[PDB]
Amino acid sequence: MKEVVIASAVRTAIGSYGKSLKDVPAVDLGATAIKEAVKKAGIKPEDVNEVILGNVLQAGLGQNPARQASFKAGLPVEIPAMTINKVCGSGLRTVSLAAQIIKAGDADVIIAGGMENMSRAPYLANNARWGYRMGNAKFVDEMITDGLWDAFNDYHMGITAENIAERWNISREEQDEFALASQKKAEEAIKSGQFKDEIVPVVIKGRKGETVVDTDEHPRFGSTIEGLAKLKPAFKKDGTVTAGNASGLNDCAAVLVIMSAEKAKELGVKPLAKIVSYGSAGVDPAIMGYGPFYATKAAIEKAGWTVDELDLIESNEAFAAQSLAVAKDLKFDMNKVNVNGGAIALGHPIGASGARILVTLVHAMQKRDAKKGLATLSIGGGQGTAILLEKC
Amino acid sequence: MKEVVIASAVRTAIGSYGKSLKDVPAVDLGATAIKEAVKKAGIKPEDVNEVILGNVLQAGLGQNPARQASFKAGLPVEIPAMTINKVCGSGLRTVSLAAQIIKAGDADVIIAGGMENMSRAPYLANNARWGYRMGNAKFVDEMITDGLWDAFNDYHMGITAENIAERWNISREEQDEFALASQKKAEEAIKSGQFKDEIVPVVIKGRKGETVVDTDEHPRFGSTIEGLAKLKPAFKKDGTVTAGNASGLNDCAAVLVIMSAEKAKELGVKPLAKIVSYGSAGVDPAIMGYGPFYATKAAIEKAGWTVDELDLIESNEAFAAQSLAVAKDLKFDMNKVNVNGGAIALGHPIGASGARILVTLVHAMQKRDAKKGLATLSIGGGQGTAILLEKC
Ligand SMILES: CC(C)(COP(=O)(O)OP(=O)(O)OC[C@H]1O[C@@H](n2cnc3c(N)ncnc32)[C@H](O)[C@@H]1OP(=O)(O)O)[C@@H](O)C(=O)NCCC(=O)NCCS
Ligand SMILES: CC(C)(COP(=O)(O)OP(=O)(O)OC[C@H]1O[C@@H](n2cnc3c(N)ncnc32)[C@H](O)[C@@H]1OP(=O)(O)O)[C@@H](O)C(=O)NCCC(=O)NCCS
């Protein structure tokens, strides 16, 4: 097989629900990231063979959101594009799909990653076409239905976290301590400039002014264990899961240029990392948060690695409960996990999230000179996906 | 690299808008086709490595429609799934994506295809979440916006068909004659049993009864040139494109089992066709209907074939105008094109359409003993995709 590398890795800041990125469509976040990713790779727009982007809340975004992001980015109309939906895994899975297509001999350069604007999701009327006839009906929150609700069990993803808290015996306190540690890591990383290299600014041009968004806004600086302990349960009576130990609803795009090592050499690109292996797996939807266990095991086996060999790990924090279960069973050294904070603090912009963690991983590997890295995350509907990277 | 084969190919009947399959969600049509494809292929569900399905109108369908179809088919939960949106080409692109993943060394057996229920598309309120504040707004038809409207030029796909008609001087009369020919061929094919081997019946459990849908209902038997000439332009004043010479809005699923030739031999499968090559291409969105010209050329070049070596062709009839343009420029022998009718008569269920013409092609190739086949179609947003088959 051809070897496959990451040439550049870029993301917008992660905006909070209804806040900083509320007026910026997902496809415009995506275009902002694409332009800057192409520029950071040091290639020309004409060098890209395909665009593959994750997006989950596609409702009313218009034909083929990936194609829209591409066009708005200045990429030639000649380049094909497609939009992938694997829920939370979308943005990570496009990167392994890119690797697969390159290994198949069909391209040398692919723009991958994902984009999401949860703040902009519509409401739906399911029976307006042919009519309600009589009686009240549901005005459906598309964000919940398309992104956050289990289609088999008829409950919120937060209930899948409670299921994991119950079965693995992970206490509210353990969940709150994990959340607090993520907040503290995120604050320290932001203030020490760890994200400065990876974040492309988004310029919001209104009728009257320009505003620049370039800082993650979701973290709660000065978080305390007492603050967390007082929070009410978010999903069920007497639940362990709360807004403080669950990831948020957020807006972001994150994009990587993926290439064959031989194309990168030819074009003078200095790659950030090699994509070593990857894997995807399914699990019972009721415990979807455990998906990364199987996906990580598959990818590691494929690579001929072990977990102990890993230098840095990004394991997406959909919920403390599930992150803890996964870490425990994979026996992670928690000092190597989400060293710049995770999604409890930073947010979870579902379509983008997988790509966002990989962006974060590859920049952290460069800065810390770490040789081997893992990114993996859980997927609503009962899946996991993972990618292993090696420094070039 | 590994050789890639099609082990089975099945579709539901194509229902008309608001009619026979109005009460059957896309994911249920998909599940129906998946179960029958796995059966026809002669494999176990546990031999399947991934499910990759096209679906365009995802709004309110719940998390990850491909996973839902996979789950409702009875496939084991350990199998991963993802949903692809490349508009009209979604269903065909999943097949070449499967071939790429297999060629990459990452799987041996993939369920691919597409599913769509256009009758069931919701209406949307885009600003219900944070408020309209004041003034009337749009109650958005999600089928139009997500499937049929150009995101760049702000007009219907039918206007892209007028554009081609104007550029190429394809007259109303020429479009109507092409339409009539498609209708006659579909009638002949339906009545002569050509679609019997490929159609899986859909069993609808109504309160009143149990009903079975197993026949394509869109064709209009006894269509006449005079009947076509009386129709009004559907998209612009004094236009050439009408309801009669455009494809319809339709509901269907079409699924294929794709495997390495090595695995097929190990499992005792007798394949239907080898996948020889494939391609995708982008064009200006305004002339999207021309996408197959470039896609087809790429595929044929990769294969080192020529157009005149083709024994059967399925070139999707999004509109008579664009089918006629692609056909003139690729120089097709029209007697080998859409021999069982095309989408003007049969319908165009967007996410499934590209898989549906591939199903139709492979069955037609076994019936007529043809050696080489091409499936190609246009994509809204200015793309094309194509697959080349050689009969085993
Ligand atoms: C949990 C959830 C319902 C909360 O949504 P919300 O009510 O809009 O959340 P908010 O961020 O507004 O938080 C509400 C209040 O909780 C409190 N809160 C949240 N995090 C806190 C923290 N670290 N410390 C103290 N208080 C906190 C605050 O009081 C906040 O009010 P404020 O913003 O005025 O201070 C939502 O984030 C959610 O659904 N998350 C899970 C997402 C998910 O399932 N993703 C898919 C994973 S597979
Ligand atoms: C053209 C379009 C708007 C028509 O929608 P519609 O009005 O719902 O179409 P209908 O099937 O109801 O047809 C309307 C009337 O036209 C007439 N008609 C359609 N096909 C006909 C034919 N072969 N002969 C005679 N009359 C015909 C009929 O009178 C019909 O009324 P009836 O069924 O009551 O007899 C719709 O099919 C469309 O938008 N098609 C294009 C889809 C598209 O763009 N797809 C994407 C491609 S990239």
Side-chain angles (χ1 to χ4, degrees):
Chain A
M1 304 291 78
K2 297 196 193 187
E3 295 201 325
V4 180
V5 308
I6 293 167
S8 66
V10 153
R11 68 172 178 92
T12 69
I14 303 159
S16 293
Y17 187 58
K19 295 180 171 329
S20 74
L21 297 182
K22 75 197 196 41
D23 299 319
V24 188
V27 299
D28 295 334
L29 295 177
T32 302
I34 290 171
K35 300 220 283 207
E36 187 64 10
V38 166
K39 177 156 136 60
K40 293 286 189 160
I43 58 168
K44 305 223 308 314
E46 21 286 304
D47 290 332
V48 175
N49 304 127
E50 201 170 353
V51 172
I52 312 175
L53 297 166
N55 180 56
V56 176
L57 309 179
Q58 304 181 186
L61 301 191
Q63 287 185 331
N64 202 352
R67 171 69 157 176
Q68 294 177 57
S70 179
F71 185 94
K72 284 164 148 287
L75 269 36
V77 296
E78 284 81 18
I79 296 166
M82 62 180 172
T83 316
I84 295 329
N85 174 1
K86 200 193 189 61
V87 203
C88 327
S90 304
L92 187 60
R93 182 70 175 100
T94 61
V95 172
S96 54
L97 208 49
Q100 293 172 308
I101 287 170
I102 293 165
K103 292 164 57 158
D106 293 325
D108 295 301
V109 185
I110 297 183
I111 277 286
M115 57 196 171
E116 202 80 59
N117 190 314
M118 304 182 71
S119 296
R120 298 180 69 84
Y123 275 65
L124 316 173
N126 283 329
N127 293 266
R129 184 171 312 275
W130 300 113
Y132 296 83
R133 189 175 193 281
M134 187 173 42
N136 287 356
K138 280 187 295 194
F139 206 40
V140 177
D141 181 332
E142 188 265 344
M143 173 189 78
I144 292 180
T145 291
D146 296 346
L148 309 175
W149 201 255
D150 190 65
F152 309 115
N153 293 112
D154 198 19
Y155 54 52
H156 201 285
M157 294 300 89
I159 300 296
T160 76
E162 290 289 358
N163 292 340
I164 288 175
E166 169 174 53
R167 290 180 47 180
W168 273 254
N169 204 189
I170 305 171
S171 69
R172 162 68 174 276
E173 273 203 43
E174 277 169 320
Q175 289 179 55
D176 289 351
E177 296 278 1
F178 180 86
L180 180 57
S182 186
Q183 294 283 356
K184 286 191 153 118
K185 287 180 306 176
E187 172 171 9
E188 175 87 340
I190 291 167
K191 282 181 175 168
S192 71
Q194 307 298 311
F195 295 136
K196 182 82 152 58
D197 280 351
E198 78 197 54
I199 291 177
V200 53
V202 166
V203 172
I204 308 171
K205 207 168 159 169
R207 244 74 179 245
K208 316 258 143 164
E210 289 216 334
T211 287
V212 174
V213 178
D214 66 4
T215 298
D216 299 308
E217 88 183 310
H218 194 72
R220 294 177 87 104
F221 287 177
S223 284
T224 65
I225 193 71
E226 292 79 16
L228 291 164
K230 63 176 27 184
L231 297 185
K232 69 185 197 135
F235 297 105
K236 68 188 278 190
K237 191 178 183 295
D238 295 305
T240 69
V241 177
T242 70
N245 63 38
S247 58
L249 311 169
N250 296 277
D251 309 327
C252 181
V255 168
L256 299 95
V257 178
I258 309 306
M259 334 176 144
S260 69
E262 86 194 310
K263 193 64 150 184
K265 271 201 41 169
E266 174 159 43
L267 296 189
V269 177
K270 285 286 155 225
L272 308 181
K274 174 176 162 178
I275 291 166
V276 176
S277 70
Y278 40 74
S280 287
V283 288
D284 170 3
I287 55 162
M288 67 90 206
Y290 197 66
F293 176 85
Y294 299 104
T296 293
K297 283 173 84 286
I300 286 287
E301 200 213 350
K302 237 232 227 53
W305 294 4
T306 70
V307 168
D308 276 8
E309 290 171 7
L310 294 173
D311 300 309
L312 283 178
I313 294 153
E314 287 284 320
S315 183
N316 197 54
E317 298 168 2
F319 301 92
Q322 68 73 37
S323 289
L324 290 161
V326 171
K328 177 183 191 217
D329 293 357
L330 288 173
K331 302 191 191 98
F332 289 158
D333 171 354
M334 296 311 274
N335 290 322
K336 302 174 168 172
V337 178
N338 298 344
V339 301
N340 293 337
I344 292 164
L346 295 166
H348 183 40
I350 303 171
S353 232
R356 200 279 302 167
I357 62 164
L358 192 67
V359 170
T360 300
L361 179 64
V362 320
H363 285 266
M365 287 171 71
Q366 295 330 278
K367 282 195 196 57
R368 299 164 187 253
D369 199 30
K371 293 161 187 36
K372 292 185 173 187
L374 163 64
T376 184
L377 80 175
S378 62
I379 304 179
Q383 312 182 248
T385 195
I387 297 194
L388 294 167
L389 295 190
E390 190 162 38
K391 225 154 88 62
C392 283
Chain B
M1 320 216 86
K2 297 189 193 201
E3 291 188 295
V4 179
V5 307
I6 288 169
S8 65
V10 175
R11 67 179 179 86
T12 69
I14 304 163
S16 291
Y17 186 63
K19 300 209 187 289
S20 71
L21 296 177
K22 77 199 194 67
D23 296 320
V24 189
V27 299
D28 294 323
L29 294 177
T32 300
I34 285 170
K35 284 196 51 149
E36 190 61 27
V38 170
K39 188 183 142 152
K40 284 292 189 183
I43 59 173
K44 294 184 265 173
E46 85 188 350
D47 303 307
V48 171
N49 298 129
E50 197 165 9
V51 179
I52 308 178
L53 297 171
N55 182 55
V56 176
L57 313 182
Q58 296 178 203
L61 296 190
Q63 286 185 328
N64 199 356
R67 174 69 162 170
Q68 295 179 57
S70 166
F71 185 93
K72 288 165 165 104
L75 300 182
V77 294
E78 292 86 355
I79 301 167
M82 59 178 174
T83 310
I84 303 323
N85 176 5
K86 195 188 194 77
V87 204
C88 318
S90 300
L92 192 58
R93 185 74 181 92
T94 65
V95 179
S96 56
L97 201 58
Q100 295 171 306
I101 290 170
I102 295 166
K103 291 164 61 174
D106 296 326
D108 282 293
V109 179
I110 299 179
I111 283 161
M115 61 196 167
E116 202 75 66
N117 189 314
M118 300 180 74
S119 306
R120 294 179 75 85
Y123 276 68
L124 317 178
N126 282 327
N127 287 266
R129 192 171 304 274
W130 305 112
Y132 292 86
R133 182 173 197 280
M134 190 168 68
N136 289 347
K138 286 177 174 181
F139 201 42
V140 172
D141 178 336
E142 182 271 337
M143 171 192 78
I144 293 195
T145 300
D146 294 344
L148 310 174
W149 197 259
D150 189 58
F152 310 110
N153 291 115
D154 193 22
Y155 54 50
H156 202 284
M157 290 304 90
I159 296 300
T160 74
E162 299 281 6
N163 292 344
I164 288 188
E166 287 165 10
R167 302 173 96 82
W168 272 257
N169 221 8
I170 292 171
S171 72
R172 167 67 177 272
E173 294 66 33
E174 187 177 1
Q175 296 177 49
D176 285 354
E177 290 162 36
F178 180 89
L180 184 58
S182 179
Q183 292 283 353
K184 289 183 191 282
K185 289 181 291 177
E187 184 173 358
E188 164 70 20
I190 287 158
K191 286 172 169 185
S192 68
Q194 307 300 317
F195 294 135
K196 279 297 197 225
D197 291 339
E198 72 195 62
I199 289 181
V200 58
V202 170
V203 175
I204 299 174
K205 267 162 203 194
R207 241 257 245 174
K208 189 64 224 287
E210 213 212 58
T211 65
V212 175
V213 181
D214 67 353
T215 306
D216 298 307
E217 76 179 322
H218 193 67
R220 283 170 178 256
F221 291 177
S223 283
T224 61
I225 199 74
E226 294 86 7
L228 292 160
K230 303 203 61 169
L231 304 188
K232 314 319 306 158
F235 296 108
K236 82 185 239 160
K237 202 237 238 121
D238 298 324
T240 64
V241 180
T242 70
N245 70 27
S247 65
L249 310 168
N250 298 271
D251 304 332
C252 178
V255 171
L256 308 90
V257 173
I258 309 305
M259 315 178 57
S260 63
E262 156 183 26
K263 196 78 183 179
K265 166 127 190 284
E266 171 191 316
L267 299 184
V269 173
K270 264 150 255 180
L272 304 182
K274 179 178 175 185
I275 296 164
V276 177
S277 62
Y278 41 77
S280 287
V283 300
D284 176 358
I287 57 148
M288 65 95 197
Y290 196 66
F293 175 86
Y294 293 109
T296 292
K297 286 242 280 204
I300 275 138
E301 239 238 308
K302 276 151 106 172
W305 289 6
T306 82
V307 168
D308 216 87
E309 275 163 17
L310 302 169
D311 303 308
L312 290 170
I313 297 157
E314 283 286 317
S315 178
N316 193 52
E317 300 173 359
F319 303 87
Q322 65 78 36
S323 286
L324 283 169
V326 166
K328 290 182 210 309
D329 285 19
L330 293 172
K331 296 180 207 329
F332 288 161
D333 169 357
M334 295 314 280
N335 285 329
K336 302 186 182 154
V337 177
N338 297 351
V339 300
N340 292 336
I344 288 160
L346 297 164
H348 184 37
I350 302 160
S353 209
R356 198 294 288 167
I357 68 175
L358 194 61
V359 173
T360 296
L361 175 66
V362 78
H363 283 279
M365 297 173 67
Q366 37 168 309
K367 242 85 107 210
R368 298 153 180 267
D369 209 350
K371 283 195 138 167
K372 291 186 169 207
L374 164 68
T376 188
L377 78 169
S378 70
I379 304 182
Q383 312 186 248
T385 195
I387 293 192
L388 288 174
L389 300 188
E390 192 168 30
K391 218 247 284 162
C392 294

